[PDB]
Design an enzyme around this catalytic site. Sequence first.
Site, short mmCIF file in Angstrom:
data_model
loop_
_atom_site.label_atom_id
_atom_site.label_comp_id
_atom_site.label_asym_id
_atom_site.label_seq_id
_atom_site.Cartn_x
_atom_site.Cartn_y
_atom_site.Cartn_z
N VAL A 25 47.27 -35.91 33.44
CA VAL A 25 47.63 -36.99 34.33
C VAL A 25 48.77 -36.58 35.28
O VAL A 25 48.78 -36.98 36.45
CB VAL A 25 47.95 -38.32 33.59
CG1 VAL A 25 46.78 -38.72 32.72
CG2 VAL A 25 49.19 -38.22 32.73
N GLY A 26 49.73 -35.80 34.79
CA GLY A 26 50.86 -35.40 35.64
C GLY A 26 51.99 -34.58 35.04
O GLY A 26 52.05 -34.33 33.83
N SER A 27 52.88 -34.15 35.93
CA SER A 27 54.14 -33.50 35.55
C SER A 27 55.00 -34.43 34.70
O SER A 27 55.34 -34.10 33.58
CB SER A 27 54.93 -33.08 36.80
OG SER A 27 55.00 -34.15 37.73
N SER A 28 54.63 -31.63 30.37
CA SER A 28 53.42 -32.15 31.01
C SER A 28 52.57 -33.07 30.12
O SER A 28 52.50 -32.88 28.89
CB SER A 28 52.55 -30.99 31.48
OG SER A 28 52.21 -30.18 30.39
N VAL A 29 51.95 -34.06 30.75
CA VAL A 29 51.27 -35.17 30.07
C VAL A 29 49.73 -35.22 30.28
O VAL A 29 49.23 -35.22 31.41
CB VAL A 29 51.79 -36.52 30.56
CG1 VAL A 29 51.21 -37.64 29.69
CG2 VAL A 29 53.31 -36.57 30.58
N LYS A 44 52.31 -35.44 25.43
CA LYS A 44 53.20 -34.72 26.31
C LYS A 44 53.59 -33.50 25.55
O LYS A 44 54.25 -33.62 24.50
CB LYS A 44 54.42 -35.59 26.60
CG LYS A 44 55.55 -34.88 27.28
CD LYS A 44 56.63 -35.85 27.83
CE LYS A 44 57.81 -35.02 28.29
NZ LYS A 44 58.95 -35.72 28.92
N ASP A 159 61.09 -42.62 30.68
CA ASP A 159 62.07 -41.59 31.10
C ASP A 159 63.52 -42.04 31.25
O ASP A 159 64.26 -41.53 32.09
CB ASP A 159 61.60 -40.90 32.40
CG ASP A 159 60.27 -40.17 32.25
OD1 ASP A 159 59.96 -39.66 31.15
OD2 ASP A 159 59.52 -40.10 33.26
O1 LIG Z 1 45.70 -42.86 32.49
C1 LIG Z 1 46.11 -42.53 33.60
N1 LIG Z 1 45.23 -41.85 34.38
C2 LIG Z 1 45.33 -41.23 35.74
C3 LIG Z 1 43.87 -40.90 36.22
N2 LIG Z 1 42.99 -42.08 36.47
C4 LIG Z 1 41.93 -42.04 35.48
C5 LIG Z 1 41.22 -43.29 35.53
O2 LIG Z 1 41.51 -43.97 36.81
C6 LIG Z 1 42.83 -44.43 36.99
C7 LIG Z 1 43.75 -43.32 36.42
C8 LIG Z 1 47.50 -42.73 33.91
C9 LIG Z 1 48.09 -42.63 35.18
C10 LIG Z 1 49.46 -42.82 35.36
C11 LIG Z 1 50.27 -43.14 34.26
C12 LIG Z 1 49.74 -43.24 33.00
C13 LIG Z 1 48.36 -43.04 32.82
C14 LIG Z 1 50.50 -43.52 31.84
O3 LIG Z 1 50.01 -44.25 30.97
C15 LIG Z 1 51.69 -42.76 31.56
C16 LIG Z 1 52.08 -42.70 30.19
C17 LIG Z 1 53.17 -41.93 29.77
C18 LIG Z 1 53.91 -41.21 30.72
N3 LIG Z 1 54.99 -40.43 30.41
C19 LIG Z 1 55.40 -40.06 29.17
C20 LIG Z 1 54.60 -39.68 28.09
C21 LIG Z 1 55.18 -39.30 26.87
C22 LIG Z 1 56.56 -39.24 26.74
F1 LIG Z 1 57.09 -38.85 25.58
C23 LIG Z 1 57.37 -39.59 27.82
N4 LIG Z 1 58.71 -39.54 27.64
C24 LIG Z 1 59.56 -40.50 28.10
O4 LIG Z 1 59.18 -41.54 28.61
C25 LIG Z 1 60.95 -40.30 27.88
C26 LIG Z 1 61.74 -41.29 27.30
C27 LIG Z 1 63.12 -41.07 27.09
C28 LIG Z 1 63.72 -39.88 27.45
C29 LIG Z 1 62.98 -38.87 28.01
C30 LIG Z 1 61.59 -39.08 28.21
C31 LIG Z 1 56.77 -39.99 29.02
C32 LIG Z 1 53.53 -41.26 32.09
C33 LIG Z 1 52.41 -42.03 32.52
C34 LIG Z 1 52.18 -41.95 33.93
C35 LIG Z 1 51.61 -43.27 34.52
#
Ligand SMILES: O=C(NCCN1CCOCC1)c1ccc2c(c1)C(=O)c1ccc(Nc3ccc(F)c(NC(=O)c4ccccc4)c3)cc1CC2
Length: 327
Positions: A25-27, A28-29, A44, A159
């Site tokens: 999905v993005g910058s 890794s996740v 991630k 984040d």
């Molecule tokens: O499922 C997605 N698909 C994109 C492609 N398309 C497919 C189908 O059509 C529409 C979307 C999507 C698209 C965008 C997003 C998410 C999911 C999301 O659920 C999502 C979920 C988690 C995430 N980041 C993440 C994951 C795991 C982690 F451990 C962290 N860490 C932190 O938040 C963090 C917390 C405290 C300190 C440091 C880090 C962050 C970032 C995102 C980005 C937003």
Amino acid sequence: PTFYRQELNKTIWEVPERYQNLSPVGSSVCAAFDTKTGLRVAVKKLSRPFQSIIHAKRTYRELRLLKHMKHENVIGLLDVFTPARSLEEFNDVYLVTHLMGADLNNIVKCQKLTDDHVQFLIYQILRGLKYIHSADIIHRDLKPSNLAVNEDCELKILDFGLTRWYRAPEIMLNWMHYNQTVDIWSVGCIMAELLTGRTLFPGTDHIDQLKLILRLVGTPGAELLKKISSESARNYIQSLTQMPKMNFANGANPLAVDLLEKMLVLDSDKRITAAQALAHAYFAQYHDPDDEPVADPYDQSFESRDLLIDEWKSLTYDEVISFVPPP
Ligand SMILES: O=C(NCCN1CCOCC1)c1ccc2c(c1)C(=O)c1ccc(Nc3ccc(F)c(NC(=O)c4ccccc4)c3)cc1CC2
Ligand SMILES: CCCCCCCCO[C@@H]1O[C@H](CO)[C@@H](O)[C@H](O)[C@H]1O
Ligand SMILES: CCCCCCCCO[C@@H]1O[C@H](CO)[C@@H](O)[C@H](O)[C@H]1O
């Protein structure tokens, strides 16, 4: 469990078999399906978690933060794993969280939301912040791309506690003694944008950012000037063509406007807090004082430690191993 291995985002991800259908999905996740709980999840893989003291402490911080946070509007830890069977081979960390499926930009698509939708959205942001802030944790870089949102528009903050369009002006000026209301500034910027469809302060660069803010909220007041020691900085400021706080209004709900005027105040000591914002009339429809919880106290004593890499790494291992999934 049994792991399997797969080429994703330029590396080899080794994950338990429960997790299937991994796609970037993005910058890794990666997004994935947890076949064991039936949840869509984000996995991630941390890059170079134990390279340096700084990476190691950052890895530990992330795990600690995510383990602690137990709230509907804050991302939390569903699982953490490693391919490693021992401390010595321990070199990789994977974190698993809810997959919401979009960030707030994806929901807005540069379009105005209805006032009611803005209410619900901002309410949830504030509810998450009250919780975060109750543990003495500050986001510091709250923005739409850090707010994960599902189909129902249920929202989780990403984040926290670690592009300048949502940043408090003091952070951009490297003030160094930040109060929790830096996140409130960010909230007002996001809110205005939900209501108009347009970036409230789309600065071209750093100085332009400060300029656009000044132009809207007006030049610093006397009380605020009192709190700045640099004579030259006051000299600059007060030599500017003096500047009124423009009317925020200018068909938005007057309660939205009032709330925005109380968030978007240069002086951070005078900004409304998350808990005060949640009691503001704007949220009468959603506010429930008995379901806006605080966090258990958060042991942040690690933040002030200078330790060796091996200790940061061992501490992290210990948290991987103690991890108990939620209900
Ligand atoms: O499922 C997605 N698909 C994109 C492609 N398309 C497919 C189908 O059509 C529409 C979307 C999507 C698209 C965008 C997003 C998410 C999911 C999301 O659920 C999502 C979920 C988690 C995430 N980041 C993440 C994951 C795991 C982690 F451990 C962290 N860490 C932190 O938040 C963090 C917390 C405290 C300190 C440091 C880090 C962050 C970032 C995102 C980005 C937003
Ligand atoms: C564009 C120039 C305006 C910058 C004014 C920023 C005012 C920030 O507000 C300041 O926040 C500090 C916490 O960081 C507090 O210590 C100060 O008490 C408070 O006045
Ligand atoms: C257009 C931007 C110019 C605004 C000048 C702001 C400079 C503020 O400087 C801040 O003052 C604080 C209180 O004195 C100090 O604690 C901080 O160390 C210092 O960064």
